[PDB]
Design a binder for these strands. Structure first.
Lengths: 190, 82, 129, 150, 84, 208
RNA sequence: GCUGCAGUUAAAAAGCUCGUAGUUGGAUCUUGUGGAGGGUUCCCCGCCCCUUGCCUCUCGGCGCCGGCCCGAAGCGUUUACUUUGAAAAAAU
């Protein structure tokens, strides 16, 4: 559809509806339909950067996330021109849980999986933003003010795929987590 | 060191060496100040105001001072890329 | 074995500072070591520190200065009840004026000077000065 | 280090940080499963199974092309053995020692080494049996050693 | 030691010639290889430390040999890593 | 270096370094001499970098300038090769030579008549003149010397690498040392040929 | 000699190993913003998903205009620890 393809996220909203309409339209069009197979989102959002530019966010149901990773570049290329003047990235949405060891009340409902934990989700989110580099290293530094800056060593191949997205990816993570990240390319590759 | 008045006490305030960040006593005769001469750096002729350093006996006697004196001049001049 | 991780950690940075160094490598990275060194950094005895990440447990690297004289561990972990405090801190510190016994309380990990203002006793971990 | 020798040594495997596919590969999750099931018929046990995949087939390991271990895949079928191969290989060794010991009563060295391998069985058994992986009435004896290895 | 040396960023192989579990990140010292000699015209992929005989489906029926470490190949080139 | 090319090594001096074989350095190494070396040949001989030699020459020489008295920068050498070289050094530039055997106690006595209190030292070869180095650390003397690959560093603050196994490497290096101090302090500056040469800082060398 | 000892030669590590009790045991499961108390972020209500976890209700008050809202009732898997109360004969 074009309005009920965003459940659990509130179906009316102007910008989000205007994305969905022309999105599913491309998938229905015969121009590409041999790798597009009528998937749907669950929400969307637009978030800026201090670079003075906007960038769009696409959420998915997450078992469907795997299929998006198949095409991921051709699709994003076409929608980079179709929605132009903004950057385009996929991401996934999880139903993160408070601890039973206590941040909200437990009833002995279930164990709480450690993939449904908080910290594992914030690691998994980073894996998708810079998916085509396939993160080589992670390092962290701690400041005298108790802040933290998270270095990410990326592969030294597939550089220009991410090099004009390099700053705009960092602003995404800020809005989702509350944390500051930097992206680097290392001295050497093994 | 301060008091109630903030009045400064201690007969001498000792000096604290550059690459070890520790203080050298009244008797300690392997601790050396080492004066490097600056130049104008337009003609390469001596010009007055010196760079002065200080090194403790502990790093001297083990043979680590050579690196420390090099690094001190490496964070300033004259050393570019060694 | 490596029964107590924190107890093996401090001896490295103690040994390293004596010889004259300013970078170290301490493993295997417990969360307990992080919040310890955070408190120890605020007061100013060490500089900023970098946590390397591995899947195994991580590794941590520290930048330090000669301001530190010695940080020790006290094991096993005894309780304090804010009248036992004065007896502990006398034996373990060079002076009343400075030195910082660390401990953990239900209000988190902190120095002894802070715990006295929150009225929280707890389990003692180490010290430094 | 070593648990019945004085030695110390490193030879442990070291895995990369990465863990993609990586890219270059084939045989979707499902393909790997049927490739495994054939091997277990032939008497190839889980340790051997991963080797024979890693050496000649395109896998790095069967934990990044599946969401499960090699053993859990076999266990979900019901085709897993009734005791771990680890325990089996200990018991497998000690019977031949006892044969050699009956044939030669003057090999005190063998008698000594048997005490180690014997006690190492009992320790291992006390892991599994507390975890409800063995019956809480099972014991190790000469008789039960003979029958359980056959 | 000069007792001041960096440990954050190491040299490409003058401080990565060390033992593999004494490095900052643990790396293998092994690699795969894409082969395809003639004795068996097929694009086979094989691990460097074979540990077992790799068989051939052509005229030949042997490709490798497991020694005390890497594996001695044969009279067939076929080489790559690739990447790792 | 510091100043862009009015102190940096010229094309001329490179020939002199290579003709005197300064670049070559002995088989055995120390762990304080690792950085100064670049690499080995296909044979036992390890090739000192000449860029790294040149930077160490400068602040060494600049420290000899930094004193306001040139009569108390006491140079010392006791090897036969380093006798003739130092004698011209401290004759040309105001300094005090101590040639041959040291005769210990001359930096800690009040009864000896050769007692002196200098500020700096400039020594050839730590392992011939180990005696003055030990006594330097009893009366707070800064110290400079010429190290080789196999000469250890201990009671020295700065090194000036060299081949210095008894060669033209010795006399050339003492000449260059005296050249630099005059470019900063003296009126010899112009940095185009000085009248005095390194052809009399070289060894006596018993003649026919 | 718990705080606080010592065991190469001064008094002193079982010849050696296995082993139950006892003692001891790796890493890993949440952070930012307005008001209030204190600085120039940081430590009683709330907000992103959570915020003293829930409901279900019904009996006895508080409301607002039959209808609707929120305190008390079961509790957050269990302990150690720590903090606050209660209860502790006099003399010393």
């Amino acid at each position: 559809s074009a309005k009920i393809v965003k459940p659990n996220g509130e179906k009316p909203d102007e910008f989000e509806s205007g994305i969905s309409q022309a999105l599913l339209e491309l998938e229905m069009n015969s121009d590409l339909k041999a790798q597009l197979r009528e998937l749907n989102i669950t929400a969307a959002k637009e978030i800026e950067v201090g670079g003075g530019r906007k960038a769009i966010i696409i959420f998915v149901p997450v078992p469907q996330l795997k299929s998006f990773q198949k095409i991921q570049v051709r699709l994003v290329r076409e929608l980079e021109k179709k929605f132009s003047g903004k950057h385009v990235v996929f991401i996934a949405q999880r139903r993160i849980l408070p601890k039973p060891t206590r941040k909200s009340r437990t009833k002995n409902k279930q164990k709480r999986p450690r993939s449904r934990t908080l910290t594992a989700v914030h690691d998994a989110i980073l894996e998708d933003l810079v998916f085509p580099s396939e993160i080589v290293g992670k390092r962290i530094r701690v400041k005298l003010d108790g802040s933290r800056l998270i270095k990410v060593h990326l592969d030294k191949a597939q550089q220009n795929n991410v090099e004009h997205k390099v700053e705009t990816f960092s602003g995404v993570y800020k809005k989702l987590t509350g944390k500051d990240v930097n992206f680097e390319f290392p001295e050497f590759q093994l | 060191m301060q008091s109630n008045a903030g009045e400064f006490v201690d007969l001498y305030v000792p000096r604290k060496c550059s690459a070890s960040n520790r203080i050298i006593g009244a008797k300690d005769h392997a601790s050396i100040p080492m004066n490097v001469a600056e130049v104008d750096k337009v003609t390469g002729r001596f010009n007055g105001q010196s760079k002065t350093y200080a090194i403790c006996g502990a790093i001297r006697r083990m043979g680590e001072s050579d690196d420390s004196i090099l690094r001190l001049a490496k964070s300033h001049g004259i050393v570019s890329q060694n | 074995v490596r029964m107590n991780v924190l107890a093996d950690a401090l001896k490295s940075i103690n040994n390293a500072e004596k010889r004259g160094k300013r970078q170290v490598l301490i493993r295997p990275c417990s969360k307990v070591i992080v919040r310890f060194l955070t408190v120890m950094m605020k007061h100013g005895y060490i500089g900023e520190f970098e946590i390397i990440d591995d899947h195994r447990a991580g590794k941590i690297v520290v930048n330090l200065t000669g301001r530190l004289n010695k940080c020790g561990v006290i094991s096993p972990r005894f309780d304090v009840q804010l009248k036992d405090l004065e007896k502990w801190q006398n034996n373990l510190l060079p002076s009343r004026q400075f030195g910082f016994i660390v401990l953990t309380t239900s209000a988190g990990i902190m120095d002894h000077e802070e715990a006295r203002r929150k009225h929280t006793g707890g389990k003692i971990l180490g010290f430094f000065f | 280090g070593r648990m019945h020798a004085p030695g110390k040594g490193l030879s442990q495997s070291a895995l990369p940080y990465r863990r993609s596919v990586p890219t270059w590969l084939k045989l979707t999750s499902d393909d790997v499963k049927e490739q495994i099931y054939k091997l277990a018929k032939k008497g190839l046990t889980p340790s051997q199974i991963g080797v024979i995949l890693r050496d000649s087939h395109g896998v790095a390991q069967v934990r990044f092309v599946t969401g499960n271990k090699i053993l859990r895949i076999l266990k979900s079928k019901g085709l897993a053995p009734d005791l771990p191969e680890d325990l089996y290989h200990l018991i497998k060794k000690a019977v031949a020692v006892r044969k050699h010991l009956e044939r030669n009563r003057k090999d005190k060295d063998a008698k000594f080494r048997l005490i180690l391998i014997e006690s190492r069985i009992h320790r291992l058994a006390r892991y599994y049996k507390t975890k409800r992986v063995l019956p809480p009435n099972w014991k190790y004896e000469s008789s039960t050693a003979s029958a359980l290895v056959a | 030691m000069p007792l001041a040396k960096d440990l954050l960023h190491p040299s490409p192989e003058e401080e990565k010639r060390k033992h593999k579990k004494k490095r900052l990140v643990q790396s293998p010292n092994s690699y795969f290889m894409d082969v395809k000699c003639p004795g068996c015209y097929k694009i086979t992929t094989v691990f460097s430390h074979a540990q077992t005989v790799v068989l051939c489906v052509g005229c030949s029926t042997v490709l490798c040999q497991p020694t005390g470490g890497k594996a001695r190949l044969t009279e067939g080139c076929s080489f790559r890593r690739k990447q790792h | 270096s510091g100043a862009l090319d009015v102190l940096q090594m010229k094309e001329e001096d490179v020939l002199k370094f290579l003709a005197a074989g300064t670049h070559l350095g002995g088989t055995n190494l120390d762990f304080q001499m690792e950085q100064y070396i670049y690499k080995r040949k296909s044979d036992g001989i390890y090739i000192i970098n000449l860029k790294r030699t040149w930077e160490k020459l400068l602040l060494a020489a600049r420290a000899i300038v930094a004193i306001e008295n040139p009569a108390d920068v006491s140079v010392i050498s006791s090897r036969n090769t380093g006798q003739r070289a130092v004698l011209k050094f401290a004759a040309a530039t105001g300094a005090t030579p101590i040639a041959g055997r040291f005769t210990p106690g001359t930096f800690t006595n009040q009864i000896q008549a050769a007692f002196r209190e200098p500020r700096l030292l400039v020594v050839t070869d730590p392992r011939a003149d180990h005696q003055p180095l030990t006594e330097a650390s009893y009366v707070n003397l800064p110290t400079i010397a010429l190290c080789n690959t196999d000469s250890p560093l201990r009671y020295v603050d700065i090194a000036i690498p060299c081949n210095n196994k008894g060669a033209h490497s010795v006399g050339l290096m003492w000449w260059m040392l005296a050249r630099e101090v005059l470019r900063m302090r003296g009126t010899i500056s112009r940095e185009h040929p000085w009248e005095v040469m390194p052809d009399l800082y070289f060894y006596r060398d018993p003649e026919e």
